[PDB]
Design a binder for this molecule. Structure first.
Ligand SMILES: CCCCCCCCCCCCC/C=C/[C@H](O)[C@H](N)CO
Ligand SMILES: CCCCCCCCCCCCC/C=C/[C@H](O)[C@H](N)CO
Lengths: 251, 57, 238, 276, 251, 238, 276, 57
């Protein structure tokens, strides 16, 4: 059906035109097992003060919009006690419930790919040059692609058809994805598990996955309709646990 | 400790013998004959099941 | 010792061999593997996933997102053509950089049926019918919608379900076709035609968008590994 | 039916049903499982084809050249020195790099094979008589004492693994187990080396595999001889996770994923076909 | 015995001096099995509108006649609904009942070899030159050999003792054959199965077999007997099936 | 390791070896074989088929169909000779390009009985008798029909059955004869003679035609493979 | 009686019967099954002969040279280049071609063996001292990237099958499975490549087996050295169908069956024998 | 997995052993000892049976 209700903590998401839920690689998020742990100290698990919904700022969708990306867990670095637990701990581990939402009308048209790319390591715009970390991702700001190539001396290559990774943008549909087609679809929800080659990791020096939102069919409508449609991203951590309590970081 | 296995033959004297010579399993040959697969992690990773004949929405 | 004799092929390096060899790190304790999600045991799990096809790749459109956007509009008369390409999933320019097309260029032979999915990305108030046809390669290209209605085809009614699947069947005389194309193993043509039109209410843009996706069916198989003619280098990367 | 064998298609007749297998929704993230039996009339075909060549072990289990190491029996400069080294990596050649980068995390054992060949350097004379050359390929783990010259004490290889090979025989070959300090080899690392998000960005901080030092163990030649050693990696017992999109753009460097912007595919003149 | 009646469809052949029937390589024609098919779509099998007898034009047998050849299925390209099914389909598959008939008298003498040669690939008359397809076989015309060599710039080598294939003409008796000796034999019937290395094939770009009719002992008689004897060829397809319906070909 | 020792013959290429060797295409999926009619498991199935013999090969007749046409006619006196050739099925010019003769030139030894079939291709109103004789090689060639009636022979009555078979028996002192001829393993002579005549009614042509066919019997065998002295080349075919 | 053993002949006495085994009809297409016991008096002979050498596996299972590939350590022109190639075919040599063309369709596995030999090119001097030469024979499947030069990236052979061989050792040898996209190798194809009955006539359109590239992996020599590599095909596990007539005429080209017209056999002066 | 078979000997210590070493059946040796045959596809491929002693017509 098209209705779905997601409740995590003291927060609820309701949707009246839901496509489905994409669950990761078929895996639900869970806590780390005893036969897979490496650290020996007892973890902390704030179950409802951290595994709740945190909404980000909306982005204005235009006809000439190329797309936006968010890098995680650095996108939620200041979102409540999820951000306070990142500062005080060396290791962390979590899965997510990403919920992207955009309604327009029955008189608008457009389509957005919503991919979750694990280890979306981006190249440089100006080559033979290392880039700054604040150009890759600010703390909650939506970093955005471009229609043509970037000549930034210290930034990523934001041409959208190469997706910043040197690949074809059409081949991103192996990563866990949905589509927001404005003809039929209102939102898009992806449940990501923890994907890493280590059981826990540091949540500052490593972007575990990157959420991209890309217009494949661009937004067009009559000039007498609503010219402003926003795209809001609401992300909930899931089964978040932490290790290595020390002073507040993060250098 | 000889492992007699089935050789790769076609469809319409078909066996080989293997002895392991070294004490490390990284010294072994390739596992050529393992063709297991399950593509539902990628092609149909949705929460509710989607039957083909029924409408998707 | 044991009396032996050396056959031809001794002291050679065949790069696709399978032989045991001694370890440089004896009794090395390898770290335990864990459950990482998304394990791949076959490249046919990758090729059975949809991947959007750049049908609109007339340059300059390949350097933008315009390459994926098949345009449709309301018509003055019916039965005109929307798009068309040869069914060469490893050699045709439309299909050889798709996710199914990139795996096939590591191989020399392919076999099986394919799935072309289409997705109407227009407004919810706009209706339409389309005929998507597959032609076996004997007679040539279809010249009209009358020529295309004689082969394997499907009429797609654009409604609440935005997508339709044209299943391209394996109709061949050999069990394998070649990835790099030739005339002996030609596979045919894919064309799309206006079955009726696009009919819209007022205050709606004229041009809409159709997205084409390719994937492999469950009887798809590949054969004869090779190097791909897509990556090159003149020197070692330093 | 055996494991790895493709599916048969079943005989289907005409339909007039309320079932709609052709109509679906791409917006759900779901790839439709449509068979040719659902949209047209088919016959019963017993398909005997197998997915043997498409396995991860068969796709990866072929040896590929990863480095070309050059060294001589007489020093020209420190690039044509008596000895040479190579930091062990898979990113300097493009054929193996594109195959490994189809996955995010891998876990394999290795076979390293050397094809060492010598050649007489260009001189005013060549008429000599030399004994057969013998080479040493010493592996140095990360953090060990490296050879600072020829005649070094570090070539005593009391604890480092070495191999010795005289020219004329079979190529040398040894097996390497899985060597990462994590649970998989990371083909990609979206992050930095320092906690302040600075330093080195990319997979370079997760590649500490050591060096591979080459020399001639012969002391001298009458006239100088240049050697070339090709390094061949064949991965075996391969596991792989999180399949990546294939790379469109060629590589520029070995420590980056930096590229030049290119179109998504090659072009044509129009979107239709126009014959009969 | 010498009498035989062959009925296929709405057509009957009667013969009062029959030698025997040669059946192929000991195989009767049949439809393709499920464990040997490659194409997945349902075949069409017009059982009586196609598997009937189609007679060709007679050829005049003279004393100086070297022989004639017909290439199949291109010899029946316009013969009823067998020709209409070739145009509309990509693949086809059939066996044949070839019936060659020639009566003279008890006062004539001659002998004809009637061979069915699978893949009778012919060389060129003028070498270092590719020949035209209409010199190999027209649509139903009997292409004929010559007593001496051919110097055609775009034709096959039609010298009959080399049989167009560079072999000895005397060694053609391994292919399925009969003889029409006018002393004893009236007709000659060969049943050919489907011979190919693929289960179905295209019936335009490939001549599956070639029927040759060669006078080994030449026709001679008194001048006061009948100076005209014809040789008629009547061919019936058997178990013909088709695949790959599209528009009418055949380019 | 296991203590070994190398015998003579190590590191050689004997072209008629039988050794295992590693595969360049590992786990290659070979396409399934189907029932193709006319499978050959032995070259003795090919050699046991009739093939018409060019007995009339006196040039210029080899460049036409006149080479196969043995001529007969009504006679003035009886007992004359029709044809004759030496029984050298791999060396004689009459029999070495026949279908039995071409297989034997790949071999050096042959053994077994043979079948010479004859076929009268005259008019149905013409009658005739013939004596076809085989002579063991000791005394020389037969000089007349009296000399030929002393060996293995058959009298053929031309009637409703147009064909007769002279069976040439294996009468040898060795178990094998040589394909390239010599005097130690000579096999003898085949001759044919008029037993009576050709008697015809009026208004019938004089000269008729006899066709000779050769094949091997079911006790025929060959031995010692070799290269055939029939195909040559001075350079590689480009 | 064992399989492959010829038949015994039975003892036969005199006859006066209405049976006529000698009289038959060639017009029926039937080869008569007459035994010597039917037309004359015979004795009982126990024949122990076998049809071993005449089997399709024994007739075909001997290695025959199929190509002679030439390449040097210094380029003269592009025929004596640093590297060379060969489109894989069985039609350039005449001995193996006549044996294969006795059948219409075959299906076999292969053994490829190389006899590589070098020789010093004619010069004003030869007095040098060179290390042993090592060669590479890379197979390129149909449609892969071919070497456009020496020092090419395509010789990295990460997915193509390669072999390496130093001079002095045993000849290299590998096994090839059955490789056709149909169900048999077609020795003959009576047809065209295009549907309009035009293009290429003959078996050339059904032969897409790829190329075989040869080089010296040594970089240089003091004086130039010419190499010759002979390619030897031995078919094994052989099936064959539809036996052809043997070829009378010699070959002219490799892609055609074109011939010059020749007589059916060699001649003699008269049709009889004339001694006593 | 040793296949002991009969060696090729004459007519008037006669066995050999074979081990298969490789995982592909195309890597195997030749099938030298298979002498089966049936020549009736070519020598007598007629529809009605033709007995030798009886007349053919
Ligand atoms: C002279 C004896 C030489 C012995 C050679 C030992 C060298 C091998 C030890 C290190 C093996 C590293 C394997 C490399 C794996 C790749 O880097 C991963 N795919 C990327 O992380
Ligand atoms: C450096 C390693 C070299 C590996 C060699 C691989 C080359 C062999 C692959 C192709 C095999 C083709 C076999 C040819 C069969 C004949 O063409 C058929 N009789 C005619 O169709």
């Amino acid at each position: 059906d098209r209705v779905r209700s997601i409740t995590l903590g003291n927060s609820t998401i309701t949707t009246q035109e839901c496509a489905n839920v994409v669950v990761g690689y078929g895996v639900w998020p869970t806590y780390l097992s005893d036969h897979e742990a490496t650290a020996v100290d007892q973890p902390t698990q704030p179950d409802v003060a951290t595994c709740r919904f945190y909404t980000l700022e909306s982005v204005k969708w235009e006809s000439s919009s190329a797309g936006w990306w968010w890098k995680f867990p650095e996108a939620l670095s200041d979102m409540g006690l999820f951000g306070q637990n990142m500062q005080y701990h060396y290791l962390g581990r979590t899965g997510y419930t990403i919920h992207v939402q955009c309604n327009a009308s029955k008189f608008h048209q457009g389509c957005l790919l919503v991919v979750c790319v694990p280890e979306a390591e981006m190249g440089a715009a100006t080559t033979d040059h290392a880039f700054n970390h604040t150009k890759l991702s600010n703390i909650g700001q939506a970093m955005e692609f471009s229609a043509k190539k970037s000549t930034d001396q210290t930034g990523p290559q934001t041409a959208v058809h190469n997706a910043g990774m040197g690949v074809a943008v059409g081949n991103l549909t192996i990563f866990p994805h949905q589509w927001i087609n404005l003809r039929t679809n209102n939102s898009a929800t992806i449940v990501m598990p923890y994907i890493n080659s280590v059981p826990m990791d540091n949540m500052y020096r490593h972007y575990n996955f990157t959420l991209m939102v890309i217009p494949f069919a661009k937004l067009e409508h009559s000039p007498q309709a609503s010219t402003y449609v926003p795209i809001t991203v609401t992300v909930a951590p899931m089964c978040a646990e932490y290790n290595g309590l020390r002073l507040a970081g993060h250098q | 400790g000889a492992q007699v296995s089935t050789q790769k033959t076609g469809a319409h004297i078909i066996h080989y013998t293997n002895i392991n010579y070294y004490k490390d399993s990284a010294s072994n040959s390739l596992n050529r004959q393992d063709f297991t697969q399950d593509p539902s992690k990628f092609t149909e990773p949705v929460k509710d099941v989607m039957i083909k004949t029924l409408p998707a929405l | 010792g044991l009396p032996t004799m050396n056959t031809p092929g001794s002291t050679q390096f065949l790069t696709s061999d399978d032989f045991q060899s001694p370890s440089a790190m004896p009794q090395f304790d390898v770290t335990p593997e864990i459950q990482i999600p998304g394990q791949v045991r076959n490249l046919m799990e990758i090729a059975e996933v949809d991947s959007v096809v750049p049908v609109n790749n007339t340059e300059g459109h390949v350097n933008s997102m315009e390459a994926y956007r098949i345009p449709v509009r309301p018509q003055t008369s019916s039965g005109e053509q929307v798009f068309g390409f040869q069914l060469q999933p490893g050699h045709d320019s439309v299909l050889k950089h798709t996710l199914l097309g990139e795996i096939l260029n590591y191989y020399a032979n392919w076999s099986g049926s394919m799935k072309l999915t289409f997705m109407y990305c227009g407004a919810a108030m706009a209706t339409g019918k389309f005929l998507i046809a597959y032609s076996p390669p004997g007679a040539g290209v279809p010249g009209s919608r009358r020529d295309a209605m004689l082969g394997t085809h499907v009429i797609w009614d654009v409604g609440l379900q935005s997508s339709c699947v044209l299943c391209v069947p394996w109709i061949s005389q050999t069990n394998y076709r070649y990835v790099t194309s030739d005339a002996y193993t030609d596979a045919g043509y894919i064309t799309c035609w206006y079955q009726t039109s696009i009919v819209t209410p007022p205050d709606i843009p004229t041009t809409s968008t159709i997205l084409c996706f390719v994937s492999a069916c469950n009887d798809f198989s590949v054969r004869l590994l090779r190097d791909t003619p897509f990556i090159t280098q003149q020197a070692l990367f330093q | 039916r055996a494991v790895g064998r493709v599916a048969d298609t079943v005989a289907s007749g005409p339909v007039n049903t309320e079932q709609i297998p052709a109509l679906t929704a791409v917006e759900t993230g779901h790839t439709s499982q449509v068979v040719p039996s659902d949209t047209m009339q088919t016959r019963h075909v017993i398909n005997y084809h197998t997915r043997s060549e498409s396995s991860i072990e068969n796709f990866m289990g072929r040896a590929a050249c990863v480095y070309i190491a050059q060294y001589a029996t007489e020093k020209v400069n420190d690039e044509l020195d008596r000895y040479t080294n190579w930091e062990i990596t898979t990113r300097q050649v493009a054929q193996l790099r594109r195959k490994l980068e189809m996955f995010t995390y891998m876990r394999f054992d290795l076979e390293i094979t050397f094809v060492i060949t010598s050649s007489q350097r260009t001189s005013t004379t060549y008429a000599s008589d030399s004994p057969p050359l013998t080479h040493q390929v010493m592996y140095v783990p990360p953090g060990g004492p490296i050879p600072k010259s020829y005649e070094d004490f570090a070539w005593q290889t009391s604890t480092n693994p070495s191999v010795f090979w005289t020219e004329g025989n079979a190529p040398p070959r040894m097996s390497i187990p899985f060597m990462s300090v994590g649970n998989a080899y990371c083909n990609f690392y979206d992050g930095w080396s320092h906690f302040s998000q600075s330093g080195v960005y990319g997979y370079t901080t997760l590649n500490n595999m050591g060096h591979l030092y080459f020399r001639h163990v012969n002391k001298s030649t009458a006239y100088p001889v240049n050697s070339v050693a090709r390094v061949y990696f064949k991965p075996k017992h391969v596991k792989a996770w999180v399949p990546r999109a294939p790379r469109l753009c060629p590589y520029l460097k070995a420590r980056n994923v930096n590229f030049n912007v290119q179109g998504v595919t090659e072009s044509r003149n129009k979107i239709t076909l126009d014959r009969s």
